[PDB]
């Protein structure tokens, strides 16, 4: 059975999914939609607040809904929602996913501990780390620890702010307060735990999540600074230091520069942003943030969960607002995580790979890339050709090109274990798609796909880069929808096929293995669905400081 049929049958109730014809113009326009009706009603209720300024009006411009306006199944869920409920402005789960990433920074503790012992003659023990972690959980959300006559942040509005510690040293982990421990051996399957610890070694890290309200009022560049200020206050208080001496500057340099791990790197001037903003998150970094890898051993499922989160992050929020704005890019993104369509294509490719090569059963060669990418692209195209309702669902060429090529690229990575062979396969898929349907995506969709084969295995200046470390600022990729989310899946795919615990950074992977995050990173699909249903409670609202 094809995985998308269940959704088509519900989305096109009363109609044969294989029938080429239908009736239009018979739905009442916007009035067919619960959500459109709600929107129009709020627009009218807004008239008094706006004092005469015109507002949303369904009679301005395009009369939406001459065709049937679709509901969408969030893939891997049973949630069916109108597209508007998946717009990032309308979906608190998507916004909290981004805020939880922006507000996280990781700081090594071994250098600060060396400053204490070597420079300040102060001993560091499990008990003193535990006391420090208690102090920073008062200081990080805005509590005072040294000065008299301090004002403080209202704890009620920053209850999402906290700090935890993790270590590759099992002997130290057994001694740390479990209330503040991210326990690698408990969060990860045994083999993944062992892999993570071999790379992390006997090193200790704190994970600081600054308040959601702070990154909403300010930006991502605030996060490493806020973390570092309160790390400094917490060392001063917990270890009873002089509150302002030369050694303190060493904690600062360590926490803001020498021992810090941020989520995202800075942008060039044309698209200027500080750290911990979406354009700076490499694809492999995002795959490590998503936690599907540690709860599923289905490499297709793992890749698909990453693609869902990355579609929200890169296409809807980054490209659709930060870099553009407006109605934005909801359905460019939802095509990669709704109706189990991408699932059908990727499970086909994974099963083709399992049968012909074995998962991780081939070294990367052009023969293998060509074989797999071609076959999965043909299968994907044939699905749109056999199901008119499928093609009316993924109505925009860009959507189709991204989804077929995502299945082709991930499947190639499953066979070969090589992300750049994967992305080479993605570029083959795109030019084959174009030649089959005599179309591809929007006006500027294939800028990176026509340059892609040559730059996939390039070793030059701004061309060559291992795929896991490419991201939204890789030059070819810096402008266009329908690629970045899927590239995150391609970064995850060879590692999921191998059963790796992470793609690029074991510190990132452990730092999000934490039930106390607000967004559920083990399944971005399920969380986004909960947001679409208006059932997700975000952080950072201001109800406690504003009138009832």
């Amino acid at each position: 059975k094809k995985l998308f049929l269940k959704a088509l049958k519900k989305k096109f109730e009363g109609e044969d999914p294989e029938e080429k014809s239908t009736n239009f113009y018979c739905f009442g326009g916007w009035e067919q939609s619960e959500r459109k009706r709600e929107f129009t009603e709020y627009a009218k209720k807004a008239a008094e607040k706006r004092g005469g300024i015109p507002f949303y009006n369904p009679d301005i411009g395009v009369p939406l809904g001459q065709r049937k306006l679709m509901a969408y199944r969030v893939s891997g869920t049973d949630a069916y929602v109108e597209g508007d409920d998946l717009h990032f402005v309308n979906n608190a789960a998507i916004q909290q996913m981004v805020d939880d990433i922006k507000r996280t920074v990781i700081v090594g503790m071994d250098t600060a501990h060396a400053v204490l012992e070597k420079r300040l003659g102060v001993e560091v023990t499990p008990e003193t780390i535990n006391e420090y972690m208690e102090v920073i959980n008062h200081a990080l959300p805005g509590g005072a620890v040294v000065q008299e006559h301090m004002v403080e942040v209202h704890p009620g509005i920053v209850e999402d702010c906290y700090a935890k510690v993790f270590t590759g040293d099992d002997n130290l982990a057994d001694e740390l307060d479990k209330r503040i421990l991210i326990d690698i051996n408990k969060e990860f399957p045994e083999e993944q735990a062992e892999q993570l610890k071999s790379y992390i070694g006997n090193r200790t890290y704190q994970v600081n999540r600054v308040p959601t309200i702070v990154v909403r009022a300010c930006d991502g560049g605030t996060v490493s600074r806020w973390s570092a200020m309160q790390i400094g206050m917490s060392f001063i208080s917990a270890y009873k230091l002089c509150a302002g001496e030369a050694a303190i500057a060493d904690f600062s340099f360590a926490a803001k520069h020498a021992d810090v791990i941020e989520m995202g790197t800075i942008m060039p001037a044309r698209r200027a942003r500080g750290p911990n903003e979406p354009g700076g998150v490499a694809f492999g970094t995002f795959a490590d943030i998503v936690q599907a890898s540690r709860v599923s051993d289905d490499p297709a499922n793992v890749s698909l969960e990453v693609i869902a989160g990355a579609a929200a992050l890169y296409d809807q929020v980054w490209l659709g607002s930060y870099m553009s704005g407006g109605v934005g890019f909801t359905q460019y993104a939802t095509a990669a995580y709704t109706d189990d369509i991408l699932d059908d294509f990727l499970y086909y490719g994974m099963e083709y790979v399992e049968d012909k090569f074995g998962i991780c059963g081939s070294e990367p060669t052009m023969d293998v890339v060509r074989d797999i990418s071609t076959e999965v692209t043909l299968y994907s195209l044939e699905q749109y050709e056999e199901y008119p309702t499928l093609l009316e669902d993924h109505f925009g060429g860009s959507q189709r090109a991204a989804v077929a090529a995502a299945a082709a690229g991930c499947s190639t990575a499953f066979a070969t274990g090589n992300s750049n062979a994967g992305v080479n396969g993605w570029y083959l898929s795109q030019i084959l798609h174009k030649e089959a349907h005599s179309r591809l995506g929007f006006y500027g969709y294939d800028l990176q796909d026509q340059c892609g084969a040559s730059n996939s295995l390039s070793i030059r200046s701004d061309e060559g880069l291992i795929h896991e470390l490419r991201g939204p600022n890789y030059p070819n990729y810096a402008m266009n929808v329908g690629h970045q989310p899927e590239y995150a899946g391609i970064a995850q795919a060879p590692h999921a096929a191998r059963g790796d615990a992470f793609c690029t950074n074991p510190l990132i992977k452990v730092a999000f293995a934490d039930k106390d995050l607000s967004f559920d990173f083990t399944s971005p699909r399920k969380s986004i669905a909960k947001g679409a249903l208006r059932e997700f409670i975000p952080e950072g609202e201001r109800d406690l400081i504003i009138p009832a």
Binding site: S252, E468, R470
Partner: protein, 442 residues
């Protein structure tokens, strides 16, 4: 010449090098040693072959704690360093007769690559050296071992890091003294980007050569920013000659006569010398007997003041053999000097203001760090136009091991890679030899 000033050039040992030299003979615009030093800083690239190899062997790619499981490449790069260096030479040079220089260091684990000036001449900025060197290193490695196409991009990533997803070579295994211009604080700040610990490592911890190299780079940067233009040029030249190059032995003699003294006694010695040399004079005597002074020659007074400043740093930090005191010394040297005399302090307040922020950001939670990590392109220590950072270079030479971010920690291979370059390691004697070469052409 343009200016009438002449000085005697004295070495770091306090002995006369060159007598009766026109001030312009040490101008960054004229001195051939300064020109070669700046050319070498721009064209030189450190290639870490051992780091490239180990990054590849572990797939430890693209920066701090990154690993990409399954993408490891195991190659004997250091064992074949000579062959690889010969290939780098062929790819980087523009002709067999040009000034391309390739030097293996540390048993082949590192290479110093000096890109030919012909390539710099047709490039817009100095990043070309790193870019061309990186391209040659990547191809040399791929060709040496016939690295297959699906592994080759890991070699690229091991050499140049996360570029172009990052704006710079984050996590790369090559480095340059100058970082890329996209990270400059101020326009024209390229030469100011060298941390004090690197300066100390290049001069092998020799106090006055470190402060000289810093002064040379800082004041040359002041020509690049347009600050040393027109009215202000003589102030910057005199600053270089006196504070950086121990003109007339004033710097050395101030330290020598105050070796058991304090910041205050250095001030008293400097004010007395300035009165003898008629650099300052009494403007008004006040009711209490206090004499308020004025400069007779403002650029020269500033140079005398800056020389006392470096001498006070050496006396007071040298007494502690602990560099943390450097910011405090720069601050209170200027503060006391002003209230002792009524005169404006070094750089008309900007060295003192720089020291205020430098003190704060080397003792507080908010940023900065220990003194060795600062430089003229740092937001904290950019404000003085060349007169403060030489003190930090001198101070870190005198630290006996009180820092966590020590020369060894931040700059551990910088000595082995760059300090064999004579003009870098020993700038005073070599700038004096340059001055002798042109003194009669001015």
């Amino acid at each position: 010449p343009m200016y009438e000033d002449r000085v005697d050039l004295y070495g770091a040992d306090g002995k006369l090098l060159e007598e009766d030299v026109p001030l312009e003979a040490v101008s960054p615009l004229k001195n051939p040693t300064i020109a070669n030093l700046v050319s070498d800083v721009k064209r030189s690239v450190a290639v870490n072959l051992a780091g490239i190899e180990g990054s590849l062997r572990k797939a430890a790619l693209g920066g701090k704690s990154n690993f990409i499981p399954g993408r490891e490449v195991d190659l004997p790069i250091v064992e074949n360093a000579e062959a690889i260096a010969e290939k780098i030479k062929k790819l980087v040079q523009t002709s067999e007769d040009d000034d391309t220089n390739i030097r293996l260091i540390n048993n082949g684990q590192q290479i110093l690559v000096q890109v030919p000036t012909t390539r710099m001449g047709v490039a817009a900025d100095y990043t070309v050296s790193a870019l061309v060197t990186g391209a040659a290193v990547v191809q040399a490695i791929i060709d040496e071992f016939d690295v297959d196409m699906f592994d080759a991009n890991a070699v690229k990533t091991a050499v140049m890091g996360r570029y172009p997803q990052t704006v710079d070579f984050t996590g790369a295994n090559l480095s340059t003294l100058l970082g890329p211009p996209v990270l400059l604080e101020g326009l024209g700040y390229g030469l100011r980007n060298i941390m004090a610990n690197h300066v100390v490592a290049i001069t092998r911890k020799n106090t006055l050569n470190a402060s000289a190299l810093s002064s040379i780079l800082e004041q040359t940067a002041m020509f690049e920013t347009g600050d040393a233009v027109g009215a202000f040029e003589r102030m910057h030249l005199l600053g270089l000659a006196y504070q950086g190059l121990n003109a007339n032995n004033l710097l050395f003699d101030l330290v020598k006569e105050n070796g058991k003294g304090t910041v205050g006694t250095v001030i008293a010695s400097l004010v007395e010398r300035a009165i003898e040399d008629r650099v300052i004079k009494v403007a008004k005597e006040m009711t209490s007997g206090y004499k308020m002074y004025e400069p007779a020659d403002w650029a020269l007074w500033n140079a005398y003041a800056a020389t006392g400043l470096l001498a006070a740093t050496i006396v007071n930090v040298g007494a502690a053999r602990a560099a943390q005191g450097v910011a405090s010394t720069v601050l209170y040297y200027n503060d006391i000097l002003e209230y002792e005399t009524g005169l404006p302090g070094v750089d008309f307040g900007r060295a003192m203001g720089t020291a205020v922020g430098f003190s704060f950001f080397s003792h507080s939670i908010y940023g900065g760090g220990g003194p060795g990590i600062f430089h003229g392109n740092h937001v904290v220590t950019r404000h003085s136009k060349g007169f403060a950072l030489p003190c930090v270079a001198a101070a870190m030479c005198l630290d006996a091991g009180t820092q966590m971010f020590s020369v060894e920690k931040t700059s551990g291979l910088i000595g082995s890679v760059y300090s064999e370059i004579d003009y870098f390691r020993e700038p005073i004697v070599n700038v004096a030899k340059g001055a002798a070469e042109i003194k009669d052409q001015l």
